[PDB]
Amino acid sequence: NPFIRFEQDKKLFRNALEVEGLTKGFDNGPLFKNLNLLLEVGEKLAVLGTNGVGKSTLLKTLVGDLQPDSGTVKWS
Amino acid sequence: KPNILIMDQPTNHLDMESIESLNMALELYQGTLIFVSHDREFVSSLATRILEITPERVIDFSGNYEDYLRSK
Amino acid sequence: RKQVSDGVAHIHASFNNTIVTITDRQGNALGWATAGGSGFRGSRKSTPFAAQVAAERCADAVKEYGIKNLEVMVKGPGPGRESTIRALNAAGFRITNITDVTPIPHNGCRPPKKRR
Amino acid sequence: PRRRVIGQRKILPDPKFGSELLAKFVNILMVDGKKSTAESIVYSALETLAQRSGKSELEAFEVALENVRPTVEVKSRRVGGSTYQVPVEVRPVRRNALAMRWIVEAARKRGDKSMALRLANELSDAAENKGTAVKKREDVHRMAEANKAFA
Amino acid sequence: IKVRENEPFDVALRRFKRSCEKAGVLAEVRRREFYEKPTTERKRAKASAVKRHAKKLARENARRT
Amino acid sequence: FCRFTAEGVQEIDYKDIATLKNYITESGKIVPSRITGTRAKYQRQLARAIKRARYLSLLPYTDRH
RNA sequence: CGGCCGCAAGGUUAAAACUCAAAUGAAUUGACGGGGGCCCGCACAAGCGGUGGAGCAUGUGGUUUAAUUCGAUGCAACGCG
Ligand SMILES: Nc1ncnc2c1ncn2[C@@H]1O[C@H](COP(=O)(O)OP(=O)(O)OP(=O)(O)O)[C@@H](O)[C@H]1O
Ligand SMILES: [Mg+2]
Ligand SMILES: [Mg+2]
Ligand SMILES: [Mg+2]
Ligand SMILES: [Mg+2]
Ligand code: NA
């Protein structure tokens, strides 16, 4: 059993993303339309789905490997 | 030591004995995270703010995932 | 299997639990669903509503036999006495008649003493 | 209280729309004894909510706030050594009062901009059984229907 | 104890047979014999019924009502 | 009240089942004299007759056997 | 202690030295009860806002001082004389 414990160098207070719209669909009809949500420094939000729903590309557009076709994300 | 962990799929290759350590660390974590791990008793263990994606309708915060998977 | 048509549903009520079973007319058990074996551990299983969950859970695990008429005989002192014979009317089984078999000694065995 | 029975309080109708229900909503989110500022936030909240739904008030405040009011809550009933909560029914007058005190509470979190935007973005989500306010309806109601064994 | 009410019952309502044994005997026969508490419990029982005849004589209380 | 045995002054027997069945409940127990109204003398013969009737299996100890 | 009875546990008959000015019975007025019944008060419940978390003002204990004047110090002392 390894002993892993992620600490925190600095604590965030208000929120993280405040995402409004992405309009991200690679070639076919967008797998998601609006996706306007916040975090208020929340937790978890376990995205689920079947093999081919778009969780990883959503995460990539969220971090910055890719960017949404139209919209913005912006971190704290 | 980051504030927000994105952690696409952490339970991919783990030992099921490192899975327990990962769960302990995630529960003890006081920062922020998102993740899309498909494991059942991982989201059941920690998740509370489900963001269910689906080509036509997306679900945002049904609850603690148990109301979710008992309604559906 | 074997498609038994008419069966018998013993109701083992008690001050601590309510064991609900369904058996054929010759006493060969088919399936049972106790109140505390349905997520009601603690003081909760000593409640009338906790016995209903026992009855509903016992409607299944015997549905394969296809029971349409039930003879229900109740036992023991407890609250899971009425709330499980009403729940047997709604689950689909038609209650032919209701019996209360209960061991009432003719002043025989000496009871315990263990409460102060 | 103990002996007497209190009748009621007569509240002035809301100025812009002569409705008594909106005035009670104004007071609930009004803090520090500043009614002048409270009405500014409330009207702006329905201002940016009527256009979203398409109609003025019958959808902005009636349906969207009847999706959050609870019908059964729980209260403690310690009588003879008990510490459980027995579900009860909530009066029609109190049903609304719980609703507005929840939308305001759910809009006090979720810090985006001035309270006009935070409250407006919360009244909308309550129209489709989505927002945090309707989540607390589930929180109370699921806890009510979980402990149905007591009555 | 048995109830049939052959065709049109749909209603248990076996209070007619409920109120013979189980109400008293099953919740009393589980302890406490001691052979002398019953003779002082019953003695204070039917001594607690005789004064009810004394307050059947308590009609002649004016009370101005 | 006691208008069942006070006139026919005799000693009850265990063969007259048609009259004993009027002094039994549906569970099989003996009906007390408080409800029926039988005098104290004939009750101690009514109780005696029933306990003989049960032994010969002309009556049941309990409603089921 | 002695006598008698008893397999034993013990029973029965049965004192004295020394010490106190009381011990005890029934009843009365209160007080009290983790006794009973009724009733009231921001007492609880239903709500709003504070204290306890931090900087400062003030008072008090302690500690120090040559002096840190004296008094108040449960509720009813501690922004009190
Ligand atoms: N490069 C790509 N080309 C085509 N479709 C893609 C591509 N990347 C993602 N997708 C689509 O996006 C959907 C969601 O992306 P994602 O890869 O997260 O899906 P997933 O199968 O749920 O996740 P994963 O298998 O990575 O755990 C996929 O189901 C797939 O149809
Ligand atoms: Mg013992
Ligand atoms: Mg004495
Ligand atoms: Mg302090
Ligand atoms: Mg003094
Ligand atoms: Na993915």
How close is the nearest chain D Cα to the Cα of A51, in Å? 27
Using the structure block, give the residue that is written with the tokens 């209650």. C95
Q: Nearest CA to A40 among A3, A76, A9, A4?
A: A76
* Shortest-distance atom of ligand 1 to CA A55: 18
Count CB-CB contacts under 10 A for residue E59.
6
A71 Cβ contact list (under 8 Å, min separation 6)? A19, A20, A21, A22, A23
DSSP letter, residue C96: E
Q: F57: phi > 0 → left, psi -120 to 50 → alpha, else beta; which?
A: left
How many Å apart are CA C35 and CA C44, to the nearest integer?
Answer: 9
Residues present in chain B in total: 72
| DSSP 3-state of B44 | helix
Q: Where are the alpha helices (DSSP H) in chain E?
A: 15-18, 37-41, 43-54
Count CB-CB contacts under 10 A for residue A71.
16
Determine the distance separating the centroid of ligand 1 and the alpha carbon of A8, expressed in angstroms.
31
Residues present in chain C in total: 116
How many Å apart are CA D25 and CA D105, to the nearest integer?
Answer: 12
Q: What are phi and psi of D99, to 5 degrees?
A: -65, -50
Separation in Å, CA B61 to CA B16, B65, C74: 28, 9, 46
Residues flanking ion ligand 6, Cβ below 5 Å: A 55-56
Identify the helix (H) or strand (E) that includes residue C29: strand C29-34
B46: its two tokens: 């920690």
| DSSP 3-state of D101 | helix
Q: What are phi and psi of E58, to 5 degrees?
A: -85, 20
Count CB-CB contacts under 10 A for residue C107.
8
Determine the distance separating the centroid of ligand 5 and the alpha carbon of A51, expressed in angstroms.
87
Determine the distance separating the centroid of ligand 5 and the alpha carbon of E50, expressed in angstroms.
66
| DSSP 3-state of D87 | strand
Separation in Å, CA D27 to CA D6, D11, D32, D34, D61: 20, 10, 11, 9, 15
Using the structure block, give the residue that is written with the tokens 């607390």. D136
Q: Nearest CA to D109 among A62, A42, B48?
A: A42
Q: Nearest CA to C36 among C59, C20, C60?
A: C20
Q: What are phi and psi of C56, to 5 degrees?
A: -65, -45
Which ligand has the nearest atom to the CA of C116?
2
C99: its two tokens: 């019996």
State the best of D130, D134, D139, D140 to mutate against chain B, taking most chain B CBs within 10 Å: D130
| DSSP 3-state of C36 | coil
Count CB-CB contacts under 10 A for residue B33.
22
- Whether C48 contacts C83, CB under 8 Å: yes
D100 Cβ contact list (under 8 Å, min separation 6)? D24, D25, D28, D29, D65
Separation in Å, CA C69 to CA C5, C23, C94, C112, D121: 7, 12, 5, 40, 57
How many Å apart are CA C95 and CA C72, to the nearest integer?
Answer: 7
- Whether D67 contacts D123, CB under 8 Å: no
Count CB-CB contacts under 10 A for residue B16.
7
Residue D78 Cβ < 7 Å to strand G: no
Q: How far apart are the first and last CA of chain B?
A: 37
How many Å apart are CA C85 and CA D132, to the nearest integer?
Answer: 41
How many Å apart are CA D136 and CA D101, to the nearest integer?
Answer: 11
* D112, amino acid identity: D
How close is the nearest chain D Cα to the Cα of C70, in Å? 26
Identify the helix (H) or strand (E) that includes residue C31: strand C29-34
How many Å apart are CA D133 and CA D123, to the nearest integer?
Answer: 9
- Whether F24 contacts F50, CB under 8 Å: yes
DSSP sequence for C2-70: TT--EEEEEEEE-SS-EEEEEEETTS-EEEEEESTTSS-TTGGGGSHHHHHHHHHHHHSSSGGG---EE
How many Å apart are CA C51 and CA C86, to the nearest integer?
Answer: 10
How many Å apart are CA E4 and CA D138, to the nearest integer?
Answer: 45
Query: Angle CA(C112)–CA(E27)–CA(E10) in degrees, nearest 5?
Result: 140
- Whether D99 contacts D93, CB under 8 Å: no
How many Å apart are CA C61 and CA C26, to the nearest integer?
Answer: 18
How many Å apart are CA D118 and CA C90, to the nearest integer?
Answer: 48
B34 Cβ contact list (under 8 Å, min separation 6)? A44, A45, A47, A59, A62, B4, B5, B6, B7
Q: Which nucleotide is nearest to D31 (CA to C1')?
A: G48
* C39, amino acid identity: G
D127: its two tokens: 């129209």
- Give the relative orientation of helices D20-29 and D35-53 as an angle to the nearest 10 degrees: 120
* D60, amino acid identity: A
Q: Nearest CA to F3 among F32, F29, F42?
A: F42
Q: Nearest CA to A55 among C35, D53, B6?
A: B6
